[PDB]
Design a protein around this ligand. Structure first.
Ligand code: ALD
Ligand code: ALD
Ligand code: CL
Lengths: 305, 302
């Protein structure tokens, strides 16, 4: 037993991380087959980070202007192209360590593992969620751009995130691997702010199921609620409305534990209205919302990759 | 910026995980050079787990009673021996993915990453601290024994933990890679309990510095304290004593932030006696004690 904020094993992604240097700027790229993907702002200049004409800046560059490395193995770039806010740099060497992969664009509320890197060297791994406002709360320093976020399924790595920027508040914004930002942000240092951060209700309920599974039962009660009455209380605390789809995906956890979804909603209603009264749930004093129902089943059933 | 509970990249350890089966007990082993390390309780029988005599249980065993699988590949056991609470299975193939590594003994308060595995395959990676009572708070199911904990130092994998058991409360216990337990535990299903858990004071202070570095400073005050007066408060709240060595270790963070160590101690004292009044620090409503001073520096600057 035990329940922890758990990342995917990173070995398959580690073997795809490289370092990309354009002039002074250095960041991380993802090496898959004969292509390296990285954030396009690697071409920017010191005094042109407000209104960069990325098209015009790139056509003026050349293949050699991009210095790429597999740690201690330099890569020759033999072609470059822009796709939205990412660059595709063709190289003469296919990555022998390329995994089975696909590019996916995740939905708010879903989770992924971030492999934080610097100078193409993996530094740490942690689990993040896509917030309802299309930001993530990560840990990213200068040089971390190009770090990727991913999931694993069987043997296939689904890449969903590339890191590009930090907004004031310490929240992080990036693109999918097609180069399109999550949310309305742009890769310019013009003033931008995130929208309302709401709590992912379906995930809080999943984590309450995880707690029961791992022996914390004190918040269970003998009340029930209707979904209608639960949602009127959720709204007041800036929780996502709980939909029938959410009830559906909580089904398996409800069946494993013997606690109906709306009975767990009644527990959450009480926790919202009255707090924890100095107790804790799975070592936390707050209601945690960065575990999905699948994350709970995955960890509690011990599935491997 | 940002501050998260961060594990080390696990790839170098993934290439070392194998599956070990004896009878109907399956757990994980660590394949380094031509040796596979695994908990010795892989040889117990279902009916003989309260009080196994491991010397007697080995009397029967042959090399071929140990089925070792590296993924699909089958590894041939050519010798076996017992060392403390681990087995060493000599196999006929050296692991071609063996990293540069060392076996290290960690002390309470220190942190490491765990790669949780089942059937020799990885499930997930997370960060743990060795608690003062010599347990860890992990996520381990049946079949997870032999999963290891480690730190990565530049090019070197330092293995410090191998998982063997769970005490009630969801509390985890194991050995180092020499096979000697952390704490007073034995690999026996006889009743055992960890000492009451206490909070790693020096680590809380480090995390408070991480918070300041990352823009959370509402808990800083005008008060100061003495080491002695702070420890009177620590004891009452079941915190570990803070020593002068701990103060020395917090020096670099104190110099980076301009907040004297005993001034941060005064902030912690007020948080202990007053709570957070509905506020949070680095996204937490509790005082976190599983980041070391070195963890903070590494994450905030690296
Ligand atoms: C890439 O490694 C790096 C990672 C961050 C964690 C710093 N990102 C950038 O350097 C990035 C480059 C631009 C051209 C996309 N800029 C930012 O992320 C930037 C950092 C701040 C702290 C200066 N933030 C930013 O431009 O946000 C928009 C903004 C601008 C002005 C006021 C509010 C918000
Ligand atoms: C190894 O895969 C597995 C991992 C655990 C997370 C289940 N560990 C064991 O099977 C281990 C083997 C023994 C011989 C060391 N036993 C335990 O860890 C055992 C688990 C419970 C579920 C029985 N714990 C145990 O015996 O703790 C001591 C104890 C015994 C009786 C009463 C209180 C405490
Ligand atoms: Cl908390």
């Amino acid at each position: 037993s035990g329940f922890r904020k758990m990342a995917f094993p990173s070995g398959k992604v580690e073997g795809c991380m490289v370092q990309v240097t354009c002039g002074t700027t250095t960041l991380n790229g993802l090496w898959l087959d004969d292509v390296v993907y990285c954030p396009r702002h690697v071409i920017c200049t010191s005094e042109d980070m407000l209104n960069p004409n990325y098209e015009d800046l790139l056509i003026r560059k050349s293949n050699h202007n991009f210095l790429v490395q597999a740690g201690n193995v330099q890569l020759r770039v033999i072609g470059h192209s822009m796709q939205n806010c990412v660059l595709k740099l063709k190289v003469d060497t296919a990555n022998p360590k390329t995994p089975k992969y696909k590019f996916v664009r995740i939905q708010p509320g879903q989770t992924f593992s971030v492999l934080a890197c610097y100078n193409g060297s993996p530094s740490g791994v942690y689990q993040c969620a896509m917030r309802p406002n299309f930001t993530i709360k990560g840990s990213f320093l200068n040089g971390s751009c190009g770090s990727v976020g991913f999931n694993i399924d069987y043997d296939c790595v689904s890449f969903c995130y590339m890191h590009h920027m930090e907004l004031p508040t310490g929240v992080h914004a990036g693109t999918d691997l097609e180069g399109n930002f999550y949310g309305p942000f742009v890769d310019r240092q013009t003033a931008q702010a995130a929208g309302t951060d709401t709590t992912i209700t379906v995930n809080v309920l999943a984590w309450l199921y995880a707690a029961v599974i791992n022996g914390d039962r004190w918040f269970l009660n003998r009340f029930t609620t209707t979904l209608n009455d639960f949602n009127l209380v959720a709204m007041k605390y800036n929780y996502e409305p709980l939909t029938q789809d959410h009830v559906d995906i909580l089904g398996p956890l409800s069946a494993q534990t013997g606690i109906a979804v709306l009975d767990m909603c009644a527990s959450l209603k009480e926790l919202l209205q009255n707090g924890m009264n100095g107790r804790t749930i799975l070592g936390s004093a707050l209601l945690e919302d960065e575990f999905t129902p699948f994350d709970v089943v995955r960890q509690c059933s011990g599935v491997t990759f």
